[PDB]
Swiss-Prot record:
Subunit comment: Interacts (via extracellular domain) with TLR2. TLR2 seems to exist in heterodimers with either TLR1 or TLR6 before stimulation by the ligand. The heterodimers form bigger oligomers in response to their corresponding ligands as well as further heterotypic associations with other receptors such as CD14 and/or CD36. The activation cluster TLR2:TLR1:CD14 forms in response to triacylated lipopeptides. Binds MYD88 (via TIR domain). Interacts with CNPY3.
Localisation: Cell membrane; Cytoplasmic vesicle, Phagosome membrane; Membrane raft; Golgi apparatus
Coiled coil spans: none
Family indicated by similarity: Belongs to the Toll-like receptor family.
Domain of life per record: Eukaryota
Domain TIR: 11-152
Impact after mutating V27A: Severe impairment of activity
Protein name: Toll-like receptor 1
C-alpha cells in the first residue's frame, strides 16, 4: 500500500478510523485486523489520543496525520458520533463532496428517522451515494475488503485551481 515515506507531506498513518464504541466488536475484530495485518498504520483517537487536549483536537489531529479518513457509519455513529463533525464541518471545510479524502463505510443501514434534520453535511455526504456497504452475504466479503484497501491506497485528488 501507499509508502507513507515517498509521500510529499509527512503523514504518520494510512488512515484514521472514526467509529462508535457500540460498533467496537466489529472494528476491533473485523476492520482493524483485516487492515493492520497487511502493514497499514491506522490512527484511533482512542489509542493514538493525547492527554490534555479536547476531544475535537484529538480527532482533528488524526485527520491531519493520516492519508485518508474512514467513517464507520451506522445508527450508533449518527446517534453518538456524528455531532462532532456536523458541528466542525460547519465552521471549517475539510472533506469535499466527491474527493478521495473521506471513505464512508455503511456498516448498518441508517433509518431516515434517526438523522436529525440539523445534520446537513451528513445527509449531503450520504446523498452522493459513495459509501462502501458491509455485505450481508458472507460470500460478498473480501470484495468489500478489496474495495476498502483500494479506497485507502487510491491517490488523493489535487486542488485544481
Amino acid at each position: 500500500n501507499i509508502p507513507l515515506e515517498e509521500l510529499q507531506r509527512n503523514l504518520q498513518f494510512h488512515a484514521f478510523i472514526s467509529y462508535s464504541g457500540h460498533d467496537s466488536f466489529w472494528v476491533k475484530n473485523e476492520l482493524l485486523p483485516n487492515l493492520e495485518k497487511e502493514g497499514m498504520q491506522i490512527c484511533l483517537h482512542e489509542r493514538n489520543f493525547v492527554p490534555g487536549k479536547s476531544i475535537v483536537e484529538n480527532i482533528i489531529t488524526c485527520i491531519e496525520k493520516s492519508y485518508k479518513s474512514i467513517f464507520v457509519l451506522s445508527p450508533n455513529f449518527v446517534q453518538s458520533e456524528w455531532c462532532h463533525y456536523e458541528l466542525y464541518f460547519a465552521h471549517h471545510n475539510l472533506f469535499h463532496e466527491g474527493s478521495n479524502s473521506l471513505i464512508l463505510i455503511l456498516l448498518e443501514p441508517i433509518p431516515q428517522y434517526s438523522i436529525p434534520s440539523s445534520y446537513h453535511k451528513l445527509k449531503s455526504l450520504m446523498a452522493r451515494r459513495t459509501y462502501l456497504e458491509w455485505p450481508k452475504e458472507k460470500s460478498k466479503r473480501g470484495l468489500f475488503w478489496a474495495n476498502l484497501r483500494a479506497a485507502i491506497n487510491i491517490k488523493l485528488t489535487e486542488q485544481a485551481k
